[PDB]
């Protein structure tokens, strides 16, 4: 019996309500407050230059056609009431394939205050494009954006605003980080304007700033390559009588660098420019290939100009370790400072 | 005022017959298409397809939707598109396409006082284009996109690009990781099927592959190993330790290069240009290694002739390899 009063109120609002017209059509501009709660920041894929994010996307506007009076000032209604009224057609400009979860029911809420103000939130999983500049891989950083706005209403009809100060209108859950290798340092919230072939639209933007963590690549790639190079220079200290032994060092060391280079090539995303890792492998490849050449030269002069052959080995015991030490100083100081 | 617009809109949709195209049983209705490309990505050689995202707009006039008294371009909710007549435009070479539906179905409907209707959609179509990988990676691919009406012939519907060559916008902002869009072209023509003749609009891109990193990553390691294998010819056989090390390292390294690339490239019947060079380099480094094993077995027997073999091999390998390289490049460039 108590619900009968609320049944009349709901049936009174929807009577004569045409949901095909935005509020204040041809009279003013519909203002839509917006804020986002990031429940979890999903993994970032370098192979596809995309990322995933789950949001409690909230919207709020004013519709004078839904004013009422009753026992309760707020009508916490069901998500099926949303389809009966007008709602913004907000989409994501750089979204690739987003999902609006509807398990076990459509994840939407609708609340109508007594003065017509509406609150209409939903749970989304947006996968967005994020262009990446991988010149300084794996010591690189990015700023993945997230742009959303109206699809059919120009900026003279619908304008989007943040509910609070732009810094505090996007909140990230403390435990939501699902990033394996990246590290979310912070986010920036901004607003902008776009001008398509149909008109001018208001675009709300938010950039998430990510810096990759170098820990994995030091263990997998950098340290084994350095050990292999240091292993290569061991051949210089062996006495000249163990000629067959030095042959093993030259052949196996070169072959080892092939395995590391190929295995580390899989982690390299498909690009058309030389990354920072490629320079390190290319230089380390030269040192190993230089040792084999050096051993070839000494073995060539041996038993023909033995005095000259021993002179090469004395210098090689110093030149090779010194240059590889200098190269590390130049390589790391150049990239780590950026 | 607000009720007036509702009255006007309901007046139009009362008696509107969705099953009948505008000017049914009369002149064909002209439809103009604008495409605003958003991104092109994943140009897969294995699947012979590319992924294209765009804004797809269509313009046409429906005399039944003309209204008067409201000097504004009505922009109705996208759910009204289920009650109007819209062209049945499809893409012939499309494999798997969808219209984005977050937060709502990405769709636009605009009416005009004279009846002109703008109907926009945001589509991510995975079109198909076969590629001739004979000259890979020194090849160009001409990937297209077909647009055609399904159920209406040229007696009912007519297509035309809106704005001439300016109908398609946003091609320059595309930055493919491995390709480079040299040019795009727009074509309008008719297609004759067994059930009639249908209009068709064709948008085609000509992609030229970037060879900037293929040369460095592939050809230089092949050439350096091939040249490195020649050094064994100038080394006297008394210093046979170097020759064994050079011979074993080169072939094994060359073998790894040839095997690794095949497992990381698309698989096809024809012999790609990249396979010819790897096969050529592998044969040359294999003969050099086999050359040493021939001399080593025989130099104890006839050291006069055995040592003379390396003297000529210092000419045969550099001469033949240069000649092979000259034929290859002038045949594949």
């Amino acid at each position, epitope marked *: 019996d108590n619900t009968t009063v609320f049944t009349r109120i709901l049936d009174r609002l929807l009577d004569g309500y045409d949901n095909r017209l935005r509020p204040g059509l041809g009279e003013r501009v519909t203002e839509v407050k917006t804020d986002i709660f990031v429940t979890s920041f999903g993994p970032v894929s370098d192979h596809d230059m995309e990322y995933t994010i789950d949001v409690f996307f909230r919207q709020s506007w004013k519709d004078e056609r839904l004013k009422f009076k009753g026992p309760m000032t707020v009508l916490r209604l069901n998500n099926l009431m949303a389809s009966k009224i007008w709602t913004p057609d907000t989409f994501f400009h750089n979204g690739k394939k987003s999902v609006a979860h509807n398990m076990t029911m459509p994840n939407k809420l609708l609340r109508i205050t007594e003065d017509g103000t509406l609150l209409y939130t939903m749970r989304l999983t947006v996968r967005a494009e994020c262009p990446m500049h991988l010149e300084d891989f794996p010591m690189d950083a990015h700023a993945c954006p997230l742009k959303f706005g109206s699809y059919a209403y120009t900026r003279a009809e619908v304008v989007y605003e943040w509910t609070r100060e732009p810094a505090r209108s996007v909140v990230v859950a403390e435990d939501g980080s699902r990033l394996n290798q990246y590290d979310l340092l912070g986010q920036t919230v901004d607003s902008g*304007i776009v001008q398509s072939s149909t008109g001018e639209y208001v675009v709300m933007t938010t*950039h998430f700033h990510l810096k990759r963590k170098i820990g994995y690549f030091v263990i997998q790639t950098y340290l084994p390559c350095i050990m292999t190079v240091i292993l290569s220079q061991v051949s210089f200290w062996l006495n000249r009588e163990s000629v067959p032994a030095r042959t093993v060092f030259g052949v196996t060391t070169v072959l080892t660098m092939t395995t590391l280079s190929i295995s580390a090539r899989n982690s390299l995303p498909k690009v058309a420019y030389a990354t920072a890792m490629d320079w390190f492998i290319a230089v380390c490849y030269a040192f190993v290939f230089s040792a084999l050449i050096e051993f070839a030269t000494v073995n060539y002069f041996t038993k023909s100009q033995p005095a000259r052959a021993a002179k090469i080995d004395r210098l090689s015991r110093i030149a090779f370790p010194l240059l590889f030490g200098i190269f590390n100083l130049v390589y790391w100081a150049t990239y780590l400072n950026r | 005022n607000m009720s007036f617009v509702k009255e006007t809109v309901d007046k139009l949709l009362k008696g509107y017959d969705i099953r009948l195209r505008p000017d049914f049983g009369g002149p064909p209705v002209c439809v103009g298409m604008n495409i605003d490309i958003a991104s092109i990505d994943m140009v897969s050689e294995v699947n012979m397809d590319y992924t294209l995202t765009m804004y797809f707009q269509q313009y046409w006039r429906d005399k039944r939707l003309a209204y008067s008294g409201i000097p504004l371009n009505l922009t109705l909710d996208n759910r009204v598109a289920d009650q109007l007549w819209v062209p049945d435009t499809y893409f012939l070479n499309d494999k798997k396409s969808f219209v984005h539906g977050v937060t709502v179905k990405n769709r636009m409907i605009r009416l005009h006082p004279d009846g002109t209707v703008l109907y926009g959609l945001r589509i991510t179509t995975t079109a198909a284009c076969m590629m001739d990988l004979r000259r890979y990676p020194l090849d160009e691919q001409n990937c297209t996109l077909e647009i055609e009406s399904y159920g209406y012939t040229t007696d009912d519907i007519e297509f035309y690009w809106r704005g001439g060559d300016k109908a398609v916008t946003g091609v320059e902002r595309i930055e493919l990781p491995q390709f480079s869009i040299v040019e795009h072209r727009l074509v309008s023509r008719n297609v004759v099927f067994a059930t009639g003749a249908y209009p068709r609009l064709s948008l085609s891109f000509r992609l030229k592959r970037n060879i900037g990193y293929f040369i460095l990553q592939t050809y230089m390691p092949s050439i350096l190993i091939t040249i490195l294998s020649w050094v064994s010819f100038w080394i006297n056989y008394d210093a046979s330790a170097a020759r064994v090390a050079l011979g074993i390292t080169t072939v094994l390294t060359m073998t790894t290069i040839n095997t690794h690339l095949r497992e990381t490239l698309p698989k096809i019947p024809y012999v790609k240009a990249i396979d010819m060079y790897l096969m050529g380099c592998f044969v040359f480094v294999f003969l050099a290694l086999l050359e040493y094993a021939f001399v080593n077995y025989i130099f104890f027997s006839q050291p006069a002739r055995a040592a003379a073999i390396d003297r000529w091999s210092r000419i045969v390998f550099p001469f033949t390899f240069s000649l092979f390289n000259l034929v290859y490049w002038l045949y594949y460039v």
Partner: nanobody
């Protein structure tokens, strides 16, 4: 070597259009963000406008509704239309390009920079 050369500008009197243009060379800035910075004499360097790959236009709070930025991706260049110029607009205008790490309104986020172009408004 990547260079950002500018042109346009000059002397204008109490408003009126004055277009300032910037052209890049040596690198394709299709995927970067090309912005515009104004540096009044001795005060500081101020953000004016920016445009990323998606043609999204950002503006400062003091030039909103007056200036207009418009890239030309084919020619790898960016322009900036000035309208209703004021005496306070007399400054040197700079051309920047970068990825906008830690925001796009911060000069520290733009690695590449232009030489500059003096713009003076008469009174």
């Amino acid at each position: 070597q990547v260079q950002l050369q500018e042109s346009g500008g000059g002397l204008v009197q109490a408003g009126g259009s004055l277009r300032v243009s910037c052209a890049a060379s040596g690198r394709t800035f299709t995927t970067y963000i090309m912005a515009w910075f104004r540096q009044a004499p001795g005060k500081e360097r101020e953000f004016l406008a920016a445009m990323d790959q998606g043609r999204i236009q950002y503006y400062g709070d003091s030039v909103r509704g007056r200036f207009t930025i418009s890239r030309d991706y084919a020619k790898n260049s960016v322009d900036l239309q000035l309208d209703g110029l004021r005496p306070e607009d007399t400054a040197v205008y700079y051309c920047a390009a970068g990825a906008g790490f830690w925001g796009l309104r911060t000069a520290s986020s733009y690695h590449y920079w232009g030489q500059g172009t003096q713009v003076t408004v008469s009174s």
